[model samples]
Target: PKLLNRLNTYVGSSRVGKRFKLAERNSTFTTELRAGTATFLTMAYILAVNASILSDSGGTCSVSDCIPLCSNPAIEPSQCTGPGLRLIQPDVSCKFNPVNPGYAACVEEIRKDLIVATVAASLIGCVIMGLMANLPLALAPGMGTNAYFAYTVVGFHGSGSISYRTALAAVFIEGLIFLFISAIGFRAKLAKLVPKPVRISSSAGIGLFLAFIGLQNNQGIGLVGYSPSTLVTLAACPASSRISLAPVITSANGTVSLLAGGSVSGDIMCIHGRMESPTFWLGIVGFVIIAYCLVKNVKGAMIYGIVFVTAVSWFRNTEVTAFPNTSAGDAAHDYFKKIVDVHVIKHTAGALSFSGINKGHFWEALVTFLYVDILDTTGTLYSMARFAGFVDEKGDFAGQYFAFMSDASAIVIGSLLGTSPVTVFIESSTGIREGGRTGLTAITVAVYFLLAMFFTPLLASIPAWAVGPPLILVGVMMMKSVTEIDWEDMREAIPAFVTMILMPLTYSVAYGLIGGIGSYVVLHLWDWGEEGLVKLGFLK
Candidate 1:
């Protein structure tokens, strides 16, 4: 009782006693093999992985209450002009309908950046996940980062937030920082400061954040926002107003292309729909598992919870029919099956996001010498550890150089494959379940990744429904951590609650992160002495 109470004080006095889910399922070689096999079978072996994830069931909506005809000018056929364009057969057929047919496919076809992002997610993520850490952390192209690239680079997709070049630079620098912290132990300054409370709070918040965002009417519902200015409404005018825009929006002077809308203005603005990110369902499951963990605090609750979520999702079987086929797990699959922004490729540029030696940058050139070596090294090491069940007691990564080197390699290789940053994920728990407690497990993971490279596309087709359940089980398994939190104290708990929901609500991990961190700081400073802070060594 004394030990439990003391521990709760540091974590915020919720309750006490660690809960075990599956007895001691750690370090069994057979278990690791099973987990590895499951990963491989689910990721690459699933046939239904190539379907689309857009539709009413998924809750993705689009602009247009009813437009007998509507279409974007960029992909808009030349024959689609004035009145004569429609009567016989509209330029875009589903476009000829009154209701929003979710004419999203046209838009997606044009956006090269989305394509690039897909490539990045797959190729780069594969390298990092497969070869380096093999931790299963996903390398997603940030939600708003693409638009930031577009507004800033003119020719590129993500320009404003961090120029494509700058973003790349940031990735490189951050990667180095990760390497420094993980390899050289420069990150220890942070390790002590990042307490279990903070970590738990942050993780819970991310789970909530993901769930909150999923509930939004995204592309599945309507694309309306808080303010009128914030809402990008287009398909609001008379259906006649929407025309197939093959001809450029020439001024009376006919010199430049008008920005925003032209022929497809209505479809562009009013279409109610959110792109179904590949992991949307998985995120939903993950968040649910977190929620369940909070309530039950059962051993291996996440594992079972994930199974429940997966079963529920599978039972739902929502789908989009307008596109080529069904959704697979990869972005290219579901993404290609939908209608996206036509301007995506109308302004494609060459040097976008290709920083350093790939284009022009001093550090980039210098990085060429050491970048691949480091990244690949990171990937190799991580893949080994993930397989080997090397995750520490805190559910975080162990500090190791070979792991860093393995990840570094994956990222470098990913870049070569025309993608974005590749890195490790914390999927080691699964391996841990299967008794993979040694270097042999790591080697097994590496071999798996090496083999994964040959089956990227084949693996991309699995649906979220299939993979979401296992995570629930994982969350169930991690329920022991929930008991570790100080729940009795409302003060600490409220903020953790906020942290949980904000992530999914804002649809931004950064938001969840910033909110949790900021709130933790204020709460600690206000409630307790700086002992916690001092423990983190934030101040004397």
Candidate 2:
């Protein structure tokens, strides 16, 4: 209603009303585009199992058998039994934090903060997207780097490889590097050096890659499954009553009958119950259609698409499940608060703590973490802004300096609290699409993340479905970059398109990037454009 009123107030139902309603009920859903993209990309989890099994056949984190654990906390952080467990562990980390009972609590509080931070961050993204047309790649708690930092680098690789101290040290070093870029305009230079198509493709690739990830992890609810009594009578159950389970599970692959000894978990049921008979194709189909409508400039496409998909899926009688949101580590909160209680200075600099503190990998990993943080932040912000249709030609922004500096400052502080880094979330872009165009949004997101540390359960309670729709939609939102690509250039388009599609398909944005850029470079050189190849700094 608030969102509707806001929209009605804006275009006045004449021009943009249809577009507004097509999007969704609230700007929050749009904000989620930013949030999900941030989380989805940075927190990517490739199930490095089979790839590991194929290469040395189950012994490394680096090879054809690299099982990337993009998501799924229970995927086992320390094990190398899967694919090419890289000799060097990937160290970015983030999650829904299911095990943490404070998950929901974390969310509610952080959701509020995210509000502030997102608004603040938007001024930067919008100006860039709007003015200089540079996509701002710096937002709160940037995508999966946290997970790669935590699990791959520090956790599995162990302190001997890259202790917390070293990791933080690396972060600081990169901070210096990013600082140099910001100060010297080298960052801007990099942006200009890259071909417009390539840059735009990278942004879209992240979106598609993430959407693909969401697709695999999500229920096929996007298809709007049907449990019509006639069909149920012919197939699943004998014209069963309103509630039916036996037929539901069999609707999809690997779906075991809850009635079987395998036994359905409570979390699964809560989520599945909602999915059993939704009104429409709530997930993927809705995404494509809504996106298509957006492309055609159809008003209220997203909102209506969501509504329709919601209605259709409900009829299918889908099932719903959720994770138990509680972590056994509460005393840690007490311990953390004792060290740097928000009550002490909560009003000011956000309850500071020795975040990364005397932990093992702090220094060794700092430089690398910071470097990854900087790049990831840059890529995320810029990419997401592009996806949200806010980025403009030059890709520059007004308050961007404040945003990057703030990210560094926050990560430095967040580290002391035993957490890796907490820069801007790419999801801030979603808020941008929702009408976030000021610093208030960034401030909102930050406050939200800080408050989150206190409790974690609330973050966990979000049904994967609730989360999935936004992600799927956000991914769609991000894919909007496709139009900007020089569709005429096959060389550029092939790699660019592949990059756009692969992220979600391979379930790894990093991999998608790696695959895309690698392919682009190879093809670029193969096409005799070696002179222009020197532009990609990372490649060298």
Candidate 3:
């Protein structure tokens, strides 16, 4: 009892407590620890999901290195007539297919690299936010921005205007710009310049965007797939029932080849079977489990669902098993059996390149990243602070300067670590609700991430179906901000509605924000001009 009391005193009243201001914050060490655990559990999906999403960009695996050389152009590379066919050039669509083992292996390595990068970046970000900002907020590479980096900036399988390395450079530069903006206190003013409705609905729009990703075949539960007539339709089917959408080429001598472009190798659509996928059913169960737990006010409901589905999918003999009887699956299963493993970042670590800086697309990408980072990070940090009761009457929180600087610095650090821009996670609300009132909560979360770094094997083995349910649920959570929009006013409603709808449809957050801001300006210009004329005594 004496030892326990001494420990508590040291934790609550000594230098440790003074550093984090535990007593002033009305939180005990144990409470902060618990709060941190809760926050980490809520956002843990990022470890798996971010890696999966970004690896689609093919990381450092350029076509020159990963793609095999084909000697004969007339015949198919896989079935070349002469001994010239050593290996086949990797098609972008062959990411999930074992058809190009070389490319698949490279992508797999990149995925592992990304997994490590995600953990390292997140832990470092959390530690910075804790020590410098003294807030309970945790930081990570953001979902929407990561998606933007992978899909729009780099494109799937490195098919975009710029390379993956150049995109990292853009992110790095954007972070420095953000740091300068925040350092000069211009970030808040820039945020204020955005129309109110667009700002309000961007969160909900990103929610829809994430939910859309959660329903697709490549990333999610296979509930939606490509349709020939209607663009998309219900397509939950077993792997055998899935069909490839890749174009077919025929030569004059009865030679046939499948062109690998514009589509994934398979699992694009269901030709016959519908709603027969065991993995889909497993994902549905996971969704139900998470929903029920959330309704019951469970602290770690998201983690429960993800872990359950992942555990079931780990059984190699089951139909829903992530490791099937294929070469890729075998390799994955062999890795999974390790249970605990450490991976060092090689391909994605410090891979930034500035070679594309002179290009128009580079400037466009940098500007877009800057705009989104400002809005997303500023909004999330303010909201989380407000939730934690840290915001005062001036709409400012204690350590406000350091908070902004910490996030901006984390963004730069994250870019250097070969990830997307780091932002304060909204999931920190869970910690705040749990009485996390100081940086200790953030430190605890960082500690957990530090431990998670050693368990890369298990983290990397998480399947898409397992991750899909939590992503959909997260989207549900983010949609709550939509109720704050001024629905009664048409000027506000139209831009807000447009922003909310366009994110998912356009598959780009930057485009949605652009569309919203553009419409807002066009709609409000006449009214602003009229008001200006009235103020200048030029109109009645």
Best by TM-score: 3
Return the lDDT, model 1, position 76: 37
Model 2: ten consecutive residues of lowest lDDT: 49-58
What is the C-alpha lDDT profile of model 2 across 143-178, one tens digit per residue? 344334433344322212444334445544555556
Steric overlap count per candidate: 112, 203, 0
Better of 2 and 3 by lDDT: 3
lDDT per model vs. reference: 0.37, 0.40, 0.84
Q: Candidate 3: what lDDT?
A: 0.84
* Winner by lDDT between candidate 3 and candidate 1: 3
Higher TM-score: candidate 2 or 3? 3
Superposition error at 445 for model 2 (Å): 5.9
Clash count, predicted structure 1: 112
Candidate 2 Cα errors over 4 Å, as ranges:
1-139, 143-176, 192-196, 218-400, 414-457, 526-540
The best-first sequence of candidates by lDDT reads 3, 2, 1
Q: What is the lDDT of residue 347 in candidate 1?
A: 19
Q: Taking the tens digit of each residue's C-alpha lDDT, what string does model 1 give over 1-540?
A: 676545434333222111111123233234435555433332321111111111111111123322233244333344456653442233322332222333443323323333433333434444344334433332323221221112221211111233334444444554555555556655445544543454566545444432222232222121222323653332222222223322254567658664452233223232233333323444455556646653664433433443443334332233421222332223455443443322222212222353443444334322321332333334434454555555577644543544455555444443333233454434433444445443333444544545444333333223333333332333243333445568887656755655555544554444554566667777777546667677888988
